[PDB]
Amino acid sequence: AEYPLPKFHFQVDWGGSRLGFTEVSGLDVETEVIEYREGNLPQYHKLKMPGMQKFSNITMKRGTFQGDNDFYKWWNTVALNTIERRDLTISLLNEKHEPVVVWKVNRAWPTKVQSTDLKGDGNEVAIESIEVAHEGLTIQNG
Amino acid sequence: IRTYPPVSFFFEVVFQGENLDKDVVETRFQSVTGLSVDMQTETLKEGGENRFEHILPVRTKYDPLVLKRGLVNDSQMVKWCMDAILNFDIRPMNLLVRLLHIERSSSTIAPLMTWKVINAWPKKWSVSEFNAEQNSIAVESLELNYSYFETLK
C-alpha cells in the first residue's frame, strides 16, 4: 500500500500472567568499526572494516494491580551466579489482531526492578518498571 | 628594581663558524635546551668531629646541548655533522645563544641575554618516527658536546 503502521497495538510474551504493558524500548543492533591505513596510500583517510557485535538492554513498564507480584519473583529467582532464563517474544499486530513484526530475544533475565513513587496530591497511577539483559535479538517482518 | 620577570619563548641561536652565521634557516629552531653546570665533590670524615663532615671540590661537568627543528632537506650544518660522523673528521666551532626582548627609547628588537658556547662538535642526530595513522611533522634533533659556556658581560 502507501500507508505506514502505528505503534499503539502490540503484545509481549515473557512467561507471566499478563501480556499487557505500557512501554517497550531498547530494540537495537550494533556493530563495531575497525580503522586501518598503510603509509603509501594515495588516500589520506582510514579504511573501515566490521568488528564485533553489541546488543542493548530491554526496558518495560506496567501499571500496578492487586495480587500481581511477578517482577519481584522473577528477579528474586537469582542465586550466586545462576538464575531462571526465559525466551522473550514481542509482536506487532494489525486490525484482525494478528502479528506483523516479531522481535525474538534469547536467554533474557532481569537486572533491575524499580518500584513507584508516592505523592499525596498525585492524580496518577502507580508505575513499576524492569530492565532485562539478553544475549542476542532477531527481527522477523513478514 | 624589577617587578616582572622575562619570557622564555623569544630566542635565537648563532653559529660562529665556516659561513653559517649568514644563513637564515640556520638560526630558526623549535627548541633549545641543555645549558647547565654541576660541581662534583667527595666526602671526608674527620675523627673527633661528629657534628659535620667535610665536602671537598673535585671537578666540573656540563650538560650536552640539544636542538630541535622541523626537517630541512638541504642543510650545510647537517653536511658538517655528517662529515664529522661518517669520515671521523671533526672541526669544533663556537656558538652564541641569545634571549631577546623589545627595547624602546621607536621600538627595536635587541638581545637581552647572551651565552658563548666554546668548542662544540657533533654528538647525536635523529629523526622522528614515520606513522601512517598520525598527524605529525617530521622533526629532527641534534645533540652537541662542548667545553664550557660563559656570559657575554
Q: What is the 3-state secondary structure (H, E, C) of B114-149?
A: EEEEEEEEEEEEEECCCCCCCCCCCEEEEEEECCEE
In angstroms, what separates the C-alpha of A48 from chain B's closest C-alpha? 13
Rounded Cα distance between B31 and B141, Å, is 9
Q: What kind and span of H or E run contains B62?
A: strand B54-62
Does A41 contact B133 at a Cβ distance shorter than 8 Å? no
| Residues of chain B that touch chain A, judged by Cβ-Cβ distance less than 8 Å | 130, 132-133
Cα dihedral A12/A15/A17/A20 (nearest 10) = -10
Rounded Cα distance between B120 and B26, Å, is 15
Residue B82 gets the label, from left (phi > 0), alpha (psi -120 to 50) or beta, of alpha
Q: Sign of torsion, CA A19 A23 A29 A34?
A: negative
Rounded Cα distance between A127 and A61, Å, is 7
Beta strands (DSSP E) in A3-142 are 10-13, 23-25, 29-36, 47-55, 58-63, 86-93, 99-114, 127-133, 137-141
> Looking up cell 512501554, which residue turns up?
A23
Q: Sign of torsion, CA B25 B26 B27 B33?
A: positive
**DSSP 3-state assignment of A70?**
helix
Instruction: State the amino acid at position A115 in one-letter form.
Output: S
Are A138 and A103 in contact by the 8 Å Cβ rule? The answer is: yes
Resolution in Å, one decimal place: 3.2
- The x, y and z cell numbers of residue B151, run together, are 656570559
Nearest to B148 by CA among B113, B115, B112, B125: B115
Residues of A in contact with B132 (CB under 8 A): 37-39, 41
Terminal Cα-to-Cα distance of chain B (whole angstroms): 20
Q: What technique solved it?
A: cryo-EM
Q: Strands B93-104 and B148-151, how do they pair?
A: unpaired
Nearest to B112 by CA among B2, B12, B33: B12
